[PDB]
UniProtKB/Swiss-Prot annotation, chains A, B:
Biological role: Capsid protein self assembles to form an icosahedral capsid with a T=3 symmetry, about 38 nm in diameter, and consisting of 180 capsid proteins. A smaller form of capsid with a diameter of 23 nm might be capsid proteins assembled as icosahedron with T=1 symmetry. The capsid encapsulates the genomic RNA and is decorated with VP2 proteins. Mediates virion attachment to the host cell receptor CD300LF.
Domain of life: Viruses
Subunit structure: Homodimer. Homomultimer. Interacts with the minor capsid protein VP2. Interacts (via P2 subdomain) with host receptor CD300LF (via N-terminus); this interaction requires Mg(2+) and Ca(2+), and allows viral binding and entry into the host cell. Stochioimetry is 2:2. Bile acids interact with the P domain dimer interface and act as cofactors enhancing virus binding and infectivity. Interacts with host receptor CD300LD; this interaction allows viral binding and entry into the host cell.
Designated name of the protein: Capsid protein VP1
Record keyword Ribosomal protein present: no
Segments for region (Protruding domain): 1-313
Stretch list, region Interaction with host receptor CD300LF: 71-139
Location of region: P1 sub-domain 2: 190-313
Region annotation (P1 sub-domain 1) ranges: 1-50
Keywords (A to Z) from UniProt: Host cytoplasm, Virion
Length: 313, 313
């Protein structure tokens, strides 16, 4: 009955927007304050939102029926008629795209393999580049169930159409804004994350995406509101909620050190009160403990940076 | 207080021994009856065993300090001084290897990348082949914190040593038997899964590994006792256990169809009573519901194959 959280340290968790471990925990007041993330969204009562999948293996991946053609001057273009990643049919509904579909922009490198159905399936694999944002003359509609990718080739390849799974390999020109899911038209979206009280900022669970530069790769940060184990926890528990938010403490249980207090709003995002202007990061080896229900206007103890140096100027 | 299970369908779950979705649910009496799996092992009270990680992203992956040398006639050989995947130090302890380390044999293709610490890390990536089983003149000790892999090259590469993460790409000559973790010596192991009553067989959650043939890839089956969300569920809940096993029903909640009853033993493995001799598979869209505590000798309702054809002969 009283909501509790799993006693799982952030560095031991699965990321909810890019399929990798959580590596970081931080607030940053210079990032967008009210992100519109479609994955990693659940309410404390267990209501899933946007495209949020249960399984972390589904994050930022897709499945499709793939039909391949050569297109003079581009190389091979695949048309992907999306299905849900469990193989069931995708029908445009009350969310923006198939479960776990990428909810950010840029150019995604995907690895596309024949679906695995039973032992001895012959498997093919092709890397493609797919543009996620609104581009630009057409034509990308994940909400309607259809997307396109290509790989550069001087000539054509052997490629026989079929059911495939696509996993993300790297990102190029990443922008953390939602893609054009519906080709101009309104589409069903989880709402921006918020509101926060004055001085309150979003707690971020962070991991890194391999970001390429043709060559040049480098890590690029991506954040999410809850790691995937907390997503799955709240979806499975379907707790009864009693007031606007939960007061939580983040604590190192080996030392007993209380690191900070934070507010988990019922709508599935955590706030801290911090007035600094730069990124502040926290150790990833504590756990969150539920303290009590609190009103929306409950005022948290502030945190600040542990570096105290200042210049007279 | 009374143990419950998350109402999550098998086809929506994360696999606990190979990092991919669960695709299949089945029993098979012709497979080894008492597998020694080191990952996907937890007791209903929440006791984790073997190398079982919390996060599904950790499954069958590793992290290391990598020191690279060319070795005339082989190509580049990396020596990997294992760390835990959260970056903390690996110390030989009361389990067979770092958390999530592969617990099967054959030749594993791994993709090895510079660790991602912050935005702008320069990233390198190399594919290697690593032999998992006891080979053969030396020398592989994941328990002691040291393993080796290589990639074939005519000449040498640019490779500067550092902290890396390795993910599994494909498997060659897969054998579902544990590797030599300690170079001949006894090593800490979760025990074989069992015992079962006469006529009782292990319920398997299945997914597929890309299995290569130099070329020729094909799907190869790998099974685990519980999917990873059930692992994480029991580790987080730490329920109080009351008797030897739990009676469960597997049910389609959309239709109400009861598909079968099964026994979840307290030691974290599920049994069904089936006397057939071939693989029997089940639909993956039901859920498990706890029914009551039962003794070890509780006799389950049998299942059988839905194909009834037989020849006089």
């Amino acid at each position: 009955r009283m909501v509790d959280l799993p006693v799982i340290q952030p560095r031991l968790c699965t990321h909810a927007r890019w399929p990798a471990p959580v590596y970081g925990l931080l607030v940053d007041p210079s990032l967008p304050s009210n992100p519109q993330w479609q994955n990693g969204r659940v309410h404390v009562d267990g209501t899933l939102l946007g495209t949020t999948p249960i399984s972390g293996s589904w994050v930022s991946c897709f499945a499709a029926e793939a039909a391949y053609e050569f297109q003079s001057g581009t190389g091979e273009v695949a048309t992907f008629t999306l299905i849900e990643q469990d193989g069931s049919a995708y029908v445009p509904g009350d969310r923006a795209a198939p479960l776990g579909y990428p909810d950010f922009s840029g150019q995604l490198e995907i690895e596309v393999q024949t679906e695995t159905t039973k032992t001895g399936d012959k498997l093919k694999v092709t890397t493609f580049e797919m543009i996620l944002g609104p581009t630009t003359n057409a034509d990308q509609a994940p909400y309607q169930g259809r997307v396109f990718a290509s790989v550069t080739a001087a000539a054509s390849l052997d490629l026989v159409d079929g059911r495939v799974r696509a996993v993300p390999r790297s990102i190029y020109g990443f922008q953390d804004t939602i893609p054009e899911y519906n080709d101009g038209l309104l589409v069903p979206l989880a709402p921006p994350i918020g509101p926060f009280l004055p001085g309150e900022v979003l707690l971020r669970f962070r991991t890194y995406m391999r970001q390429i530069d043709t060559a040049d790769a480098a890590a690029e940060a991506i954040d999410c509101a809850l790691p995937q184990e907390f997503v799955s926890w709240f979806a499975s528990n379907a707790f009864t909620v009693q007031s606007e938010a939960l007061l939580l403490r983040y604590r190192n249980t080996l030392t007993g050190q209380l690191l900070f207090e934070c507010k988990l709003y019922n709508e599935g995002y955590i706030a801290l009160s911090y007035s600094g202007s730069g990124p502040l990061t926290f150790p990833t080896d504590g756990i969150f403990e539920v303290v009590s229900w609190v009103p929306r206007l409950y005022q948290l103890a502030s945190v600040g940076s542990l570096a105290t140096g200042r210049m007279l100027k």
